[PDB]
């Protein structure tokens, strides 16, 4: 990709005891224009892996198609093996690095959640190929706005519960909506646990504007 065109705002992910939860807004902005306000920037890779992207939505759809095809083929094989979230993370890192080396990178920053063998996985894949695993992740303006709160809470309490992680993610979404021009009120909470990947419907933030009257 060379022109980002329709872009994504930010994806925040955090791991709790029992799985991982990620969140993303439902907005694809051409420039400063909202334009598409109902797209989904989160996909279910398999029963134990989830994926959220920030950047060119066309590249996100291309990755969706490719990953879905790989999962379908592996399921067809039926040999009793499943792509672990770490394997998907490695594959995405390799693909992004190859595209970067070809001077035609995919303009998305990807957050990979998962829960396999009783181990929460939370991966980060950038445009160039920078890959790492962290207890909390945030792309775009997330790394500046939401990441502080996530890191503070985690370094305070190393392990969170599902409800605590969801509340923290909702607070981060509220902050991002308050202080990000490319953010949107409607977002999408996706959680992966032992049961599987569960993607919640469109949720809105609790706006507060008392400071407007305070002045």
């Amino acid at each position: 990709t060379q022109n980002p065109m329709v872009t994504g705002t930010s994806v925040l992910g955090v791991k709790f005891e029992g799985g991982v939860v990620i969140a993303a807004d439902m907005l694809g902005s051409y420039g400063s224009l909202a334009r598409f306000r109902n797209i989904s920037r989160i996909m279910r890779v398999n029963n134990s892996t989830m994926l959220g992207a920030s950047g060119d939505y066309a590249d996100f759809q291309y990755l969706k198609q490719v990953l879905g095809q790989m999962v379908i083929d592996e399921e067809l094989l039926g040999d009793g093996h499943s792509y672990s979230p770490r394997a998907i993370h490695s594959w995405l890192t390799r693909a992004m690095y190859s595209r970067r080396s070809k001077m035609n990178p995919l303009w998305n920053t990807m957050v990979i959640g998962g829960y396999a063998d009783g181990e929460s996985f939370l991966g980060y894949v950038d445009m160039l190929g920078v890959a790492y695993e962290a207890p909390s992740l945030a792309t775009g303006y997330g790394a500046y706005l939401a990441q502080p709160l996530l890191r503070e809470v985690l370094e305070k309490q190393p392990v969170l519960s599902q409800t605590e992680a969801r509340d923290l993610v909702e607070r981060c979404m509220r902050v991002l909506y308050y202080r990000d021009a490319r953010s949107y009120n409607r977002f999408q909470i996706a959680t992966v646990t032992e049961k599987g990947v569960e993607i919640e419907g469109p949720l809105s933030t609790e706006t507060n504007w008392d400071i407007a009257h305070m002045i």
Binding site: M5, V6, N38, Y57
Partner: protein, 215 residues
């Protein structure tokens, strides 16, 4: 003197979906810079018997993409011995645009009717992303009618209501947008067929100007 300007459609394309079909609309002005090369052009290019497309951007690129997609869709329909789906044409357009996003610019929205999913409207802006929308507007003049379509769009609109809404929004765009003008061309696609009408002169909806006496 005023040459070396690639002929850009500079359209205001619109497609509204109703119960059992889709209503298409666009202006008829193509400006090479600021000179109106063509003022009665046909921006609604039929892809199949019951599938149409609206071209926005470079005239040559959109025309070539439309011709290629028409050829591919005709071959595919002959092979399958079934009426083609609107989603298939949208997917072909998306693949063509995404493959050559860095080579050609073409904002194309595809609307039509198929037996399975009925009237559908798909938008494929520059970049190669595809999403289904109840109503889709594109082109240079679409920016001036985003609020109008957002406010005046309802659910369950009838065929004639959709035609009137499209005519009003398009006329506002032509009035405000310099690159948009000419006549309003409409195409209502349904199971029975596609019936096309052209609104010119007094037929084009007229909106009262402020006309403040001091000015």
């Amino acid at each position: 003197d005023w040459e070396s300007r690639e002929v850009s459609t500079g359209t205001t394309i619109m497609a509204v979906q109703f119960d059992g079909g889709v209503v298409l609309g666009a202006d008829s002005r193509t400006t090479t810079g600021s000179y109106i090369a063509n003022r009665v052009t046909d921006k609604l290019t039929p892809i199949h018997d019951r599938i149409f497309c609206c071209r926005s951007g470079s005239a040559a690129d959109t025309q070539a993409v439309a011709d290629a997609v028409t050829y591919q869709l005709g071959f595919h329909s002959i092979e399958l011995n079934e009426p083609p789906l609107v989603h298939t044409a949208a997917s072909l357009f998306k693949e063509m645009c995404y493959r050559y996003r860095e080579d050609l610019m073409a904002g194309i929205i595809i609307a039509g009717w198929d037996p399975q999913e009925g009237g559908q409207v798909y938008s494929v802006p520059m970049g190669g992303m595809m999403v289904r929308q109840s109503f889709a507007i594109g082109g240079s003049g679409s920016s001036y009618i985003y609020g109008y379509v957002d406010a005046t769009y309802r659910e369950g609109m009838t065929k004639e209501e959709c035609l009137q809404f499209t005519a009003n929004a398009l006329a506002l765009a032509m009035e405000r947008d310099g690159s948009s003008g000419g006549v309003i061309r409409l195409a209502a696609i349904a199971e029975s067929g596609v019936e096309r009408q052209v609104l010119l002169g007094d037929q084009i909806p007229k909106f009262a100007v402020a006309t403040l006496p001091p000015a």
